[PDB]
RNA sequence: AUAUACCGCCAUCUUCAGCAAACCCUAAAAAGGUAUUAAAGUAAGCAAAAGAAUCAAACAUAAAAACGUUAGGUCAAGGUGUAGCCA
RNA sequence: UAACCCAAACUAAUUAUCUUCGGCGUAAAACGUGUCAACUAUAAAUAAAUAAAUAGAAUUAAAAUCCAACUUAUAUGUGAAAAUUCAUUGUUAGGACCUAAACUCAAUAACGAAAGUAAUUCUAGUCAUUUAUAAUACACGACAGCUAAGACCCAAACUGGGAUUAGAUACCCCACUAUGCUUAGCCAUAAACCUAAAUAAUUAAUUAACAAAACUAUUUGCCAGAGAACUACUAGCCAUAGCUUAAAACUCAAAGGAC
């Protein structure tokens, strides 16, 4: 049996998001890609360096916004600009988000030497695609 | 111990609001695309959403959509009883009020025809509606046994003398079979600078592709890639494959063909030319002959192509030796 | 006439010793048993022997037994069609009688009841 | 298969399509009208309306082919037919007028009648009686009877020949010696019949 | 009151479980014990069933008509 | 050190047709619950199906394949419970 | 460590206090069968004439066996073989024998207390006590077995030979005896079970399961966890490796019935 990235069935009480519900074979069919860069296109270089930055950028955002992430973040690279689009729960006060945005942007712009912007869409609570 | 989200049944006020938001959506989408709201249509909407939200997901159900609420929201079956609680339909307690209400009518029709007392093929090339289509008409779910019984009752109605009312009735449950035109698409007949008539058609066998240019008048001179056919095809079986189209129609030595085949091997290239010549020669033969070609295999593309190899297997079907135990 | 079943079983009514000792209760079931398969008989066995008989005399040379060889084909050719025609038609028709499946469904439309309703 | 089960095998008989409509039996006439609404498999690369195409020889060629080498197998068959035609012309020219009449110089007619002679009519088969297998004489079917004649020919020539002889020279000499019913392949047919004779006792075990 | 296998209709027992009264036509082979208002009579003949169907239809229509008239008379008195 | 504490990622049955939740019925129920000319079963979820992929079409091939079975495989991909070494 | 119970007591060992109106188709239990007493109950005055009860005598159709005539070269036997046999084998409208057993009828259900009993014929013969209820008495009691004398077609423990198997003191093959039969006597045992005592009712006021529906009264018999135990000891007996009668020590926390 295949165990890869499959949220298995319980007794109908496990909420799962759209991203979690779909197994790997639905990638490019029902669900898209969380990161969009040009490094895996044919005749393009620096796939390894873009992929390592993604791993870190995801671990950074989880720790910097602990318990405030409704879904996995979406990374969008255009030219040298990096754009982070994160669904965040409305747990923290509003002013705290302004602090963490200023901090996380400046810190990641001086770490990778690129302009990095954070885009936050706040949800009242996690969106449930289906109960499995 | 059931704790899952219940069906979010859509009330009429809900769908009514979903139609006001959609109507305001169209006016905004029109203003974005610079079009006139009055004439903006469903077709323009689908094109606009595809431009503004490019998605390359293979399944099109998973792509962005701004459709009318009627298309997306399933028709809610209306309440079957009123405020006092009395069901609206006398067959409510059967559990299949619409299936049995229809079977009640057809059984009553049969009785009047049998009591009251020509060719029955008033409609031809038609089929009985499939179970899925019937379910939609009744707005309920049926079993296979329910479908089988409904058809038998409808057949009995046709057997009996039928007035025009019955013919219209049974018509509702007969779907016009869109029998496809399994006939050749004859090519046009162009004219060269010399003024001679000629037709062209493509052919594909395995990975080979050919583009023949048959001429209406000729002495049987076939040139493949600017070479003769005896030179290009040193094997007899490959030449016989080029002979099959003309020999069949007794048209040997009456046409001049110019071929251009690229790709594949010797046998795959002869086969591709055979199909290309058969399809080009259609314009210079009678329709009865074209059917004679189609029914002899000359006009069908061969779908047999090399099958991908499988991981964990020696070949497409060949397996690794099951090791001795 | 069905044999008598009065004073056979061992019961408090019966004064004498029992006659019948059924393995199972004597109550008609609502089904019939699945009829055990029946096979046919060899066809053209006589014609095969005739062909083989001629070979033995003529050192298994088909030149001598040309006529007999053609009779063997003739019988086989007839039987070949007969088995084809009879399986396609007679078996499908089931006109003469009901099968175990068809019989049981009729026996269930008017089932035997050994219990009060 | 890449052909859906609704596809029909092609009919590549030139005369059939050009026959007058009245000459066709209504059963044949019915199929033509039905086929107008059906799908037709493409003809094979070896399927042609040629007047020189013989299915029996085309099948015999495929049974000699090794590893998809159709050119070599077809070449060997062409050399065989030629080797038989050249062997009969020599005999015909070197024969009296009376003898010349009997001599057959058609290689296609020597090939067909040679194979038919080798065909075995009855061969032993394993049949199950009482959960046990017995070797009972059985009537061989048409396809199995034809296959056995060709297989026995291609196997005598392939194996039981000198090292320096070639297949067109062993096959020609075997088709000709089976056109007169005096060859090794005929002896193999006489063994299959001889063995069935010994086991005739178990003939009635057959249930068809 | 019997199904097509000559057994009591399932709704006879299930209607008693729900405490629903039952008016049933019972013949000499049926079980009237659970029928609230048994009507002994022939259930097979078309003339018997047609008579019973007519009686239940005329009875029900009369009762519904009487209710309309009773409501009109009493309602009219309220203004009058 | 322990895969006989596990995660992770798989094998096998298997391209097998089931699985589990909420109910309902039984002269009591350990359990069982189908008959279509229908006799106590019902209506949702997962799997199958459908759909998508191999860039017309079909077919085919891939992929997919629930709950379980084998304390199946892997502490040596990485991580980790408990125990152990720390000149 | 804390809690809980009892408390000038508390725990352990020992002993004692609680005792039949229940059961007997399958869980323990209806005696192999019948008859005669005294009680305890019961209340009617019938029965019998029955197709295979029982005993005796006579009888015989089929199939065997023996002798004889003629006669294949083999006969016999198995899943396959071997062994065995040619003093055989097949036929006999030929002779003798009268050993043993009773096809069809029997899809019948009779008789008898039970055991048991069905080839034919004849003789003898079952029968009335209101009913239930009996041993320490009397009379019976399949099959096997014992004693003496006979019978002997066939079958057949044992035994010998052949085969199978790792072995085969077996299952299969061949030969043959005790024995099955008769005449007396003995033995007294069976899953002697229709696992249901007999008699008179009743069929509603009534499903532990399964089996062959439930259930009342009467009288006797029997049962009281399993194993030890169809045993030990005792007494009776034609029984002597026997039958009936029938414990305890000791062991266990279950055994058992139905599903
Ligand atoms: K018994
Ligand atoms: Mg290969
Ligand atoms: Mg039994
Ligand atoms: Mg009735
Ligand atoms: Mg494991
Ligand atoms: Mg697999
Ligand atoms: Mg597709
Ligand atoms: Mg699928
Ligand atoms: Mg393990
Ligand atoms: Mg291991
Ligand atoms: Mg007992
Ligand atoms: Mg003799
Ligand atoms: Mg005699
Ligand atoms: Mg007398
Ligand atoms: Mg021995
Ligand atoms: Mg003796
Ligand atoms: Mg004796
Ligand atoms: Mg005893
Ligand atoms: Mg007895
Ligand atoms: Mg004893
Ligand atoms: Mg004793
Ligand atoms: Mg003693």
User: Could you tell me which chain C residue has the CA closest to the CA of D188?
Assistant: C60
Q: Of A85, A72, A70, which Cα lies nearest the Cα of A126? A: A70
Cα B59 from chain centroid (whole Å): 18
Any C CB within 8 A of D103 CB: no
CB atoms within 10 A of CB E35: 20
Q: Which residues contact B11 (CB under 8 A, 6 or more apart)?
A: B76
Q: Taking the C1' atom of F39, which residue's CA lies nearest?
A: E5
Q: What is the DSSP letter of D24?
A: S
Contact B296 D71 (CB under 8 A): no
Dist CA B127 CA B170 (whole Å): 11
3-state secondary structure of B109: helix
Identify whether the C-beta of residue D110 lies closer than 8 Å to the C-beta of residue D51: no
Element at B99 (helix H, strand E): helix B97-116
Q: What does the DSSP 8-state code read for residue A27?
A: B
Residue C17 Cα to ligand 18 middle (Å): 21
Residues whose Cβ atom is located within 5 A of ion ligand 2: B 315, 318
Size of interface B-D (CB pairs under 8 A): 77
Q: What angle do CA B222, B225, B229 make, to 5 degrees?
A: 35
Residue with the two structure tokens 């870190």: A56
Going by their DSSP bridges, the two strands B257-259 and B222-224 should be labelled as: parallel
Largest Cα span, chain A: 48
B-chain residues near D37 (CB < 8 A): 179, 182
Continuous H helices in chain A: 18-21, 47-64, 94-112
Chain D residues inside the 8 Å CB shell of B294? 40
Q: Is D178 exposed, middle or buried (0-12, 13-18, 19+ CB in 10 A)?
A: buried
Ranges of beta strands (E only) in D1-159 are: 7-8, 39-40, 122-129, 132-139
A128 vs B3, B5, B57: nearest CB: B5
Resolution as reported, in Å? 3.1
Of B2, B4, B58, the CB nearest to A28: B58
Q: Chain D contacts of B305, Cβ < 8 Å?
A: 2
Judged by CB atoms closer than 8 Å, whether chains meet at C111 and E5 is answered as yes
- Distance between Cα C33 and ligand 18 center (Å): 45
Helix (H) or strand (E) holding E40: strand E37-40
- The backbone torsions φ and ψ at residue B212, rounded to the nearest 5 degrees and listed phi first, read -85, 155
User: Are B274 and B203 contacting, i.e. CB atoms less than 8 angstroms apart?
Assistant: yes
**DSSP secondary structure of C8-61:** -S--SS--S--S---SS-----SS---PPP-----SSHHHHHHHHHHHHHTTT-
User: Is strand G in 7 Å reach of the CB of C18?
Assistant: yes
Q: Are E25 and E9 in contact (CB under 8 A)?
A: no
Q: How far apart are CA A101 and CA A119, in angstroms?
A: 9
Tell me the C-alpha distance between D112 and D105, whole Å. 13
Q: Which residues lie closer than 8 Å to E55 by C-beta, 6 or more apart?
A: none
Four-residue CA torsion sign, A106, A108, A114, A118: negative
Q: Which residues of B touch D (CB under 8 A)?
A: 179, 182-183, 235-237, 240-241, 243-244, 247-248, 250, 267, 270-271, 275, 291-292, 294-305
C23 touches strand G (CB under 7 A): no
Q: State how far the Cα of D106 lies from the Cα of D175, in Å rounded to an integer.
A: 12
DSSP string covering D95-106, please?
S-HHHHHH----
Q: Which nucleotide is nearest to E3 (CA to C1')?
A: F39
Inter-CA distances, D22 with D25, D26, D28, E41, Å: 8, 9, 11, 72
**Residue of C110, C112, C117 to mutate for E, most E C-beta atoms under 10 A:** C117
Q: With beta carbons less than 8 A apart as the criterion, state whether B302 and B232 touch.
A: no
Nucleotide nearest to C6 (CA to C1'): G109
Q: Closest to A12 (Cβ–Cβ): which among B4, B56, B58?
A: B4
Q: Which of C51, C60, C62 shows the shortest C-beta gap to D194?
A: C60
Give CA–CA dist D84/D108, Å, rounded. Answer: 9
Strand ranges (E), chain B: 126-128, 174-176, 190-191, 197-205, 208-215, 222-224, 227-228, 257-259, 261-262
Q: How far apart are CA A124 and CA A90, in angstroms?
A: 6
Residues 6+ apart with CB under 8 A from B106: B150, B153, B154, B157, B169
Task: Kindly give the pairing relationship between strand B208-215 and strand B222-224.
Answer: unpaired
Inter-residue contact B190 to B200 (CB < 8 Å): yes
Residue E39 per-residue DSSP state: E
**Which residue from B70, B85, B81, B74 is spatially nearest to B8, judged by alpha carbons?**
B74
- Chain G: nucleotides below 7 Å from protein CB are 107-112, 115-116, 194-196, 211-213
CA neighbours within 13 Å on the CB side: how many for C114?
6
Cα C20 to chain center, whole Å?
A: 30
* Strand duo A81-89 + A116-123: pairing: parallel
Structure tokens at C86: 């009879």
Q: Tell me if there are at least 3 CB pairs under 8 Å linking chains E and C.
A: yes
Any chains having at least 3 CB pairs less than 8 A from chain D are B, C
Q: How many residues make up chain E in this entry?
A: 80
Q: Which residues of C65-92 are buried (b: 16+ CB within 10 A; e: fewer)?
A: beebbebbbebbeebbeeeeeeeeeeee
Q: Tokens standing for D102? A: 């009997």
- For residues B255 and B215, is the Cβ–Cβ distance under 8 A? yes
Which H helix or E strand runs over A121?
strand A116-123
The shortest C-alpha distance from D76 to chain B (Å) reads 14
* Nearest nucleotide (C1') to alpha carbon of C8: G109
Residue A42 has φ and ψ, to the nearest 5°, of: -65, 135
Contact D196 C62 (CB under 8 A): no
> Mapping DSSP to helix (H, G, I), strand (E, B) and coil, where does residue B205 land?
strand
Size of the C and E interface in Cβ pairs below 8 Å: 11
Q: Looking at the complex, does the CB of residue B7 fall below 8 Å from at least one CB of chain A?
A: no
Closest CA to B107 of B32, B197, B42, B169: B169
Using an 8 Å Cβ cutoff, are B212 and B280 in contact?
yes
User: E5-34: buried (b, 16+ CB within 10 Å) or exposed (e) per residue?
Assistant: eeebeeebeebeeeeeeeebbbeeebbbee
Q: What is residue B20's DSSP assignment?
A: H
CA gap B8, B16 in Å, rounded? 15
CA distance B237 to A99: 81
Report the 10 Å Cβ neighbour count for B109. 21
Residue E39: strand pairing partners: E25
**In Å, what is the separation between the CA of D38 and the C1' of F43?**
44
CB atoms within 10 A of CB B277: 26
> Which residue in the block uniquely carries the two structure tokens 């010696």?
D177
Chain B residue numbers touching D32 (CB-CB < 8 A):
295
Q: Which of C82, C45, C61, C66 is nearest to D139 (CA)?
A: C45
Q: Supply angle C-alpha C38, C43, C49, rounded to 5.
A: 140
Element housing A77 (H / E): strand A74-78
Q: Is C44 an interface residue toward D (CB < 8 Å)? A: yes
CA-closest candidate to residue B157, choices B204, B200, B108, B226: B108
- Give the residue ranges of DSSP H helices in chain E: 10-17, 46-77
């Amino acid at each position: 049996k295949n165990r890869a990235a499959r949220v298995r069935v319980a007794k109908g009480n496990k909420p799962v998001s759209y991203e979690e519900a779909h197994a790997p074979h639905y990638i490019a069919h029902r669900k898209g890609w969380l990161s969009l860069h040009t490094g895996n296109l044919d005749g393009e270089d620096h796939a390894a360096e873009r992929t390592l930055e993604d791993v870190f950028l995801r671990k950074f955002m989880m720790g910097t916004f602990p318990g405030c992430l409704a879904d996995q973040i979406v990374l969008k690279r255009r030219a040298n600009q990096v754009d982070i689009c994160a669904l965040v729960l409305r747990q923290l006060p509003a002013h705290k988000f302004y602090f963490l945005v200023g901090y996380s942007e400046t810190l990641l712009s001086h770490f990778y030497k690129c302009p990095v912007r954070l885009h936050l869409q706040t949800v009242p609570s996690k969106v449930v695609y289906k109960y499995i | 111990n059931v704790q899952a989200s219940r069906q979010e049944s859509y009330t009429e006020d809900f769908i009514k609001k979903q139609i006001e938001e959609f109507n305001i959506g169209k006016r905004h989408l029109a203003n974005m695309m610079g079009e006139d709201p009055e004439t903006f249509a469903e077709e323009d909407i689908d094109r606009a959403i595809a431009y503004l939200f490019p998605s390359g997901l293979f399944e099109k159900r998973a792509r962005p959509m701004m459709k009318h609420p009627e298309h997306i929201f399933p028709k809610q079956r209306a309440t079957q009883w009123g405020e006092d609680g009395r069901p609206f339909h006398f067959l409510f307690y059967t559990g299949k009020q619409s299936y049995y209400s229809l079977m009640h009518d057809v059984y009553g029709k049969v009785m009047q025809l049998e009591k009251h007392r020509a060719e029955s093929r008033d409609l031809i090339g038609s089929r009985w509606l499939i179970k899925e289509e019937l379910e939609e008409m009744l707005v309920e779910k049926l079993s296979d046994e329910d479908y089988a019984q409904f058809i038998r009752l409808l057949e009995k109605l046709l057997t009996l003398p039928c007035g025009p009312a019955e013919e219209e009735f049974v018509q509702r449950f007969r779907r016009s079979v869109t029998i496809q035109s399994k006939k050749q698409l004859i090519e046009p007949v162009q004219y060269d600078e010399q003024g001679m008539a000629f037709s062209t058609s493509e052919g594909r066998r395995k990975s080979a592709t050919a583009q023949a240019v048959v001429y209406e008048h000729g002495s049987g001179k076939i040139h493949v890639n600017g070479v003769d056919y005896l030179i290009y095809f040193p094997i007899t079986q490959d030449r016989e494959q080029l002979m099959f189209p003309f020999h069949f129609l007794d048209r040997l030595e009456r046409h001049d063909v110019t071929c251009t085949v690229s790709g594949g091997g010797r046998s795959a290239q002869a086969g591709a030319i055979r199909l290309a010549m058969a399809r080009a020669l259609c314009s210079f033969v009678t329709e009865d002959e074209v059917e004679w070609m189609r029914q002899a295999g000359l006009l069908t593309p061969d779908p047999r192509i090399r099958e991908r190899k499988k991981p964990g297997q020696e070949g497409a079907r060949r397996k690794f030796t099951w090791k001795k135990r | 006439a069905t044999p008598s079943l009065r004073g056979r079983l061992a019961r408090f009514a019966n004064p004498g010793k029992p006659i019948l000792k059924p393995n199972k209760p004597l109550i008609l079931a609502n089904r019939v048993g699945n009829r055990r398969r029946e096979k046919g008989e060899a066809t053209c066995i006589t014609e095969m022997s005739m062909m083989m008989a001629c070979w033995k005399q003529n050192e298994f040379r088909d030149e001598a037994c040309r006529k007999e060889i053609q009779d063997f084909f003739d019988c086989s050719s007839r039987a070949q069609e007969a088995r084809k025609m009879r399986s396609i038609q007679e078996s499908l028709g089931q006109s003469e009688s009901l099968s175990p499946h068809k019989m049981t469904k009729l026996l269930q439309r008017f089932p035997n009841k050994s219990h009060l309703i | 298969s890449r052909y859906a089960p609704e596809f029909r095998e092609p009919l590549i008989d030139k005369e059939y399509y050009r026959k007058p409509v009245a000459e066709l039996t209504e059963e044949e006439k019915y199929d033509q009208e039905l086929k107008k609404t059906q799908f037709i498999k493409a003809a094979a690369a070896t399927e042609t309306s040629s007047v020189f195409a013989d299915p029996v020889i085309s099948k015999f060629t495929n049974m000699m082919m090794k590893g998809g080498n159709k050119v070599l197998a077809r070449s060997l068959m062409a050399q065989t037919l030629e080797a038989v035609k050249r062997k009969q012309f020599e005999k015909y020219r070197a024969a009296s007028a009376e003898e010349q009449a009997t001599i057959e110089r058609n290689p296609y007619r020597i090939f067909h009648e040679a194979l038919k002679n080798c065909e075995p009519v009855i061969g032993l088969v394993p049949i199950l009686k009482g959960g046990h297998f017995y070797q009972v004489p059985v009537p061989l079917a048409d396809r199995r009877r034809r296959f056995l004649a060709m297989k026995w020919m291609i196997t005598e020539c392939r194996e039981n020949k000198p090292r320096r002889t070639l297949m067109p020279e062993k096959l020609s000499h075997e088709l000709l010696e089976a056109f007169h019913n005096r060859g090794p392949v005929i002896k193999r047919k006489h063994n299959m019949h001889k063995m069935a004779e010994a086991n005739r006792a178990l003939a009635h075990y057959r249930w068809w | 009151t019997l199904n097509n296998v000559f057994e009591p209709h399932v709704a006879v027992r299930d209607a008693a479980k729900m405490n629903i009264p039952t008016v049933g036509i019972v013949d000499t082979n049926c079980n009237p014990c659970l029928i609230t208002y048994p009507i002994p009579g022939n259930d097979d003949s078309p003339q018997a069933i047609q008579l019973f169907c007519k009686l239940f239809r005329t009875t029900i229509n009369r009762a519904k008509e009487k209710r309309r008239q009773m409501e009109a008379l009493h309602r009219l008195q309220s203004p009058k």
